[PDB]
């Protein structure tokens, strides 16, 4: 059975207990912490591409009101985010299983942009998700996995200084 684990869940959970925030910029900002995934149970010899996307966890706009995040009352449907291809893709199962798959080069933006960067809506909550796509073979297959521990709200600047302090402490 294909197994997907989050690396450094210890640390993600500290961020999650505070409500995590990720900066978005017009040019695109890399994530901290970085999503790193442990994968076992692939065919060492089969070909796979890793995809990362961000699910809108709810349909609301969030605001930091008197030291607390609180959702708006006017939900709107959220169009799905674009997919980021891990730059090691396509690659053999052995490649993906020899070390945690690290999405260190994805950039989060608030503006529709050339290529690479993934556009999110500021003040929406997101749940990172990967797709593992078996390619080249006769039988295409997709395995998907969400990471609730890695949920964050997209922000143009940090609101909760406890997040700011954790970000620096651990970078
Ligand atoms: C890098 N790459 C893939 O891994 C393809 C299997 C996909 C569809 C996810 C690719 C290459 C050119 C154009 N699109 C996607």
UniProtKB/Swiss-Prot annotation:
Statement: the UniProt record of this protein carries the keyword Transcription regulation: yes
UniProt GO cellular component terms: chromatin; nucleoplasm; nucleus
Subcellular location(s) of the protein: Nucleus
Record keywords, A-Z: Activator, Developmental protein, Disease variant, DNA-binding, Nucleus, Transcription, Transcription regulation
GO annotation, biological process: anterior/posterior axis specification, embryo; cardiac muscle cell myoblast differentiation; cell fate specification; heart morphogenesis; mesoderm development; mesoderm formation; negative regulation of transcription by RNA polymerase II; positive regulation of transcription by RNA polymerase II
Highest taxon, organism lineage: Eukaryota
Location, primary (coarse class): nucleus
UniProt-recorded Gene Ontology molecular function terms: DNA-binding transcription factor activity; DNA-binding transcription factor activity, RNA polymerase II-specific; RNA polymerase II cis-regulatory region sequence-specific DNA binding; RNA polymerase II-specific DNA-binding transcription factor binding; sequence-specific double-stranded DNA binding; transcription corepressor activity
Feature: DNA-binding region: 11-171
Tissue: Detected in testis, but not in other, normal tissues. Detected in lung tumors (at protein level).
Disorder association: Neural tube defects: Congenital malformations of the central nervous system and adjacent structures related to defective neural tube closure during the first trimester of pregnancy. Failure of neural tube closure can occur at any level of the embryonic axis. Common NTD forms include anencephaly, myelomeningocele and spina bifida, which result from the failure of fusion in the cranial and spinal region of the neural tube. NTDs have a multifactorial etiology encompassing both genetic and environmental components.
Function recorded in the entry: Involved in the transcriptional regulation of genes required for mesoderm formation and differentiation. Binds to a palindromic T site 5'-TTCACACCTAGGTGTGAA-3' DNA sequence and activates gene transcription when bound to such a site.
Quaternary state and interactors: Monomer.
Protein name stated in the entry: T-box transcription factor T
Organism: Homo sapiens (Human)
Full protein: residues contained: 41 to 211 of 435
């Amino acid at each position: 059975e294909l197994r997907v684990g989050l690396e450094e869940s210890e640390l993600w959970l500290r961020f999650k207990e505070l409500t995590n925030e990720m900066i978005v910029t017009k040019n695109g900002r890399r994530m901290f912490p970085v999503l790193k995934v442990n994968v076992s149970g692939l065919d060492p010899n089969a070909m796979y591409s890793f995809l990362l996307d961000f699910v809108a966890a709810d349909n609301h706009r969030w605001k930091y009101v008197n030291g607390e995040w609180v959702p708006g009352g006017k939900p709107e449907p959220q169009a799905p985010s674009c997919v980021y291809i891990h730059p090691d893709s396509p690659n053999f199962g052995a490649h993906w299983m020899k070390a945690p798959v690290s999405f260190s080069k994805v950039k989060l933006t608030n503006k529709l942009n050339g290529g690479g960067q993934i556009m999110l809506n500021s003040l929406h909550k997101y749940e990172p998700r990967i797709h593992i796509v078996r390619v080249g073979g006769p039988q295409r297959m997709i395995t998907s996995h969400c990471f609730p521990e890695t949920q964050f709200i997209a922000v143009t600047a940090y609101q909760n200084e406890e997040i700011t302090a954790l970000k620096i402490k651990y970078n």
